[PDB]
Amino acid sequence: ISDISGSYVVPGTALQPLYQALDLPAEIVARAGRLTATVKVSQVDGRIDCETLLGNKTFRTSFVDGAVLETNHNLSFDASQSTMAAGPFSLTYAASAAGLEVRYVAAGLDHRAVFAPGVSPRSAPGEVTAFCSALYRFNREAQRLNFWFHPEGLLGPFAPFSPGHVWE
Ligand SMILES: O=N[O-]
Ligand SMILES: [Zn+2]
Numbered sequence: 646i647s648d649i650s651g652s653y654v655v656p657g658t659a660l661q662p663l664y665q666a667l668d669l670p671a672e673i674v675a676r677a678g679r680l681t682a683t684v685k686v687s688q689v690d691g692r693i694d695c696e697t698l699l700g701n702k703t704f705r706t707s708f709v710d711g712a713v714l715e716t717n718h719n720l721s722f723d724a725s726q727s728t729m730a731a732g733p734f735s736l737t738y739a740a741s742a743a744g745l746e747v748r749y750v751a752a753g754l755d756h757r758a759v760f761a762p763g764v765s766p767r768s769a770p771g772e773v774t775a776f777c778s779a780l781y782r783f784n785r786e787a788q789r790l791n792f793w794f795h796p797e798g799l800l801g802p803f804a805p806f807s808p809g810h811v812w813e
Contacts, residue, residue, distance in 0.1 A: 649740040650688050653760040653802065655697075656681040660804055666754040667805055668791065673783060676776040682800040683765040686745070691724045697797040698765070700773030704797035705813055712808035715793035717784070720808055729803055732792070736803060747802050760802055 657664075657677035664674040682699040693708040710722040714731055721730040729736050733751045740746075744761040777796045784793050792798070798807025 646740055648688055649693075649738065649745055650686055651740070651745075651762055652683060652685050652764060653745050654681065654763050654765040655684050655760050655800055655802060656765070657800060659758040659760065660749075660756075660799070662754060662756040663749050663804055664799065666749075666751055666756075667794070669794075670783060673776075673779055676772070676779060677799050680768045680772060680776060680800055681765045682768070682797070683763075684760075684797075684801055686802070688724070691722070693722075693724075693803075695797070695801065695803070697801055699796060699800055700768045701770035702773055702777070702796070703813075704795065706795075706797060706801075706807055706809050708803060708806070708808060714806065714808055715811070716791065717788045717793055720806060729806060731806055734805060736806075738802065745802050749804070758802075 657680045661678055664677055682697050685696040687694040695706045697704040708722055712720040714720055718731055727738050735750045736747055738745060738747045744759050746759045749756045780794055780796055792805055794805060795807035798805050
């Protein structure tokens with residue numbers, strides 16, 4: 646309960662209101678909706694390490710208070726209150742037998758998702774590759790003007806937050 650450590654199934658169908666609130670194009674919202682990932686969560690002290698298995702891709706992230714978040718700011722993380730926040734977005738989580746339950750809050754957004762424990766079915770690697778490439782285009786085209794979204798940032802319990810660099 647107090648330790649959320651485990652393996653969870655995170656399907657894109659469970660986060661569609663969040664993707665819409667991120668001002669993502671219809672193609673990205675729909676592509677993420679067809680994808681599903683396994684996220685292995687390890688909570689140590691005031692840190693959360695995440696390994697996301699998505700098609701033929703592995704992504705690793707670590708959630709710590711003050712972690713830099715790429716844009717085009719910093720992550721606020723309080724493990725004692727099970728809260729994460731950055732920019733307009735905030736989230737709260739709790740683990741149970743039904744899995745990892747997360748509430749995502751922002752102006753115009755109040756969405757809850759529950760991610761069941763276990764291992765996810767494997768999304769097709771062609772769909773994952775097309776999704777990652779389309780997210781990359783959106784990020785670059787949106788510089789000619791939000792977070793720099795990572796694929797594991799959208800297909801994850803703590804979306805839209807993805808610390809770390811664009812590389813592993
Ligand atoms: O809806 N996938 O382009
Ligand atoms: Zn990443």
